[PDB]
Design a protein around this ligand. Structure first.
Ligand SMILES: [Mn+2]
Ligand SMILES: [Mn+2]
Lengths: 205, 205
């Protein structure tokens, strides 16, 4: 069974960028529900119930048709949010090989940011914006609802290894920014954990 | 060009069920944006610009590829919300031919409510729940994002004439109910405008 992972910091650790109230609800309510629903579906699937969540979402096709969707949505939700919590932190700075790779594939850090913001703002409805690594090259893509590029193009419409991502479901920014998703996206640059992003870039898996 | 319709009641006319703050933001910000983007996309196409919004969304395949998605999302958003505002009102009661048709196709009003609640609660991500008239029978269906059953099954995955609908995008209930969409859905029964619903059922078009 999966369990709600504890945050790598306190609920108010991202103030004044991300509000304390949302962090709490987003974690203890939204993420908790994904964990609970994923467990309920896995009770009758012992073979898959033991796989790490990041691995299970790469094998959605091997699941019985009546379970494919519920797990895509909930296991996907669990995987995405787990990665999201670890990708947030104040006080880090973009540098090293990651910074070099970004300037190489996007021209500059500013071009990259503009590209990411555009993808995040243009995702209509619920979804995520990602910075992924594919073919030794970095790219910006977005997915719908709780889909992840780890699921493959056939399923999510995107592919690649997630380096970092931004949750653009309205629950992630409505209490503080309401309809102003653009302001939320800009505030994100202040809390993106570049150390974790660099770490994932180094691992490549 | 489309004009943002004014509400048929005060922004707090639905209290204590739907909060005043949300009604205002939902109307003046979210709906306003859909109208703005729909009008901008129609600036160059005079043919379709003259058509009522309800008609335009039934002819999406007759639009140039580059204009199809932007209008599907925004003209759809304009049509859905316009219908939504008119479908809300306190103090009405289900009765007459509509009440009869509901008991006929669902067994009872309670079965209908349960079916509607299920569709509204199970719509993952952003979307709408609808009570549609498919020929001579009533049915409950849901669509994603700003799709409308008026767009046809090929596009929205559903079809039929909308009698009434519920917006389940998180912005419609997050300020007051946060993650508790089920409480929001229950509260909806107190503000559904049955008179307007009955009127639409009578017109059938
Ligand atoms: Mn989320
Ligand atoms: Mn809405």
């Amino acid at each position: 069974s999966y369990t709600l992972p504890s945050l790598p910091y306190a609920y108010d650790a991202l103030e004044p960028h991300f509000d304390k109230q949302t962090m709490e609800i987003h974690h203890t309510k939204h993420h908790q529900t994904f964990v609970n629903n994923a467990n309920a579906a896995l009770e009758s699937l012992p073979e898959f119930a033991n796989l790490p969540v990041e691995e299970l979402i790469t094998k959605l096709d091997q699941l019985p048709a009546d379970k494919k969707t519920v797990l895509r949505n909930n296991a996907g939700g669990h995987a995405n949010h787990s990665l999201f919590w670890k990708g947030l932190k104040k006080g880090t700075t973009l540098q090293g090989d990651l910074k070099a790779a970004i300037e190489r594939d996007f021209g500059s850090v500013d071009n990259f940011k503009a590209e990411f913001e555009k993808a995040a703002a243009s995702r209509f409805g619920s979804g995520w914006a990602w910075l992924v690594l594919k073919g030794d090259k970095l790219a910006v893509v977005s997915t719908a609802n709780q889909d992840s590029p780890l699921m493959g193009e056939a399923i999510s419409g995107a592919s690649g290894f997630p380096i970092m991502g931004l949750d653009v479901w309205e629950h992630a920014y409505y209490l503080k920014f309401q309809n102003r998703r653009p302001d939320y996206i800009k505030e994100f640059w202040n809390v993106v954990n570049w150390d974790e992003a660099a770490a994932r870039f180094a691992a490549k898996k």
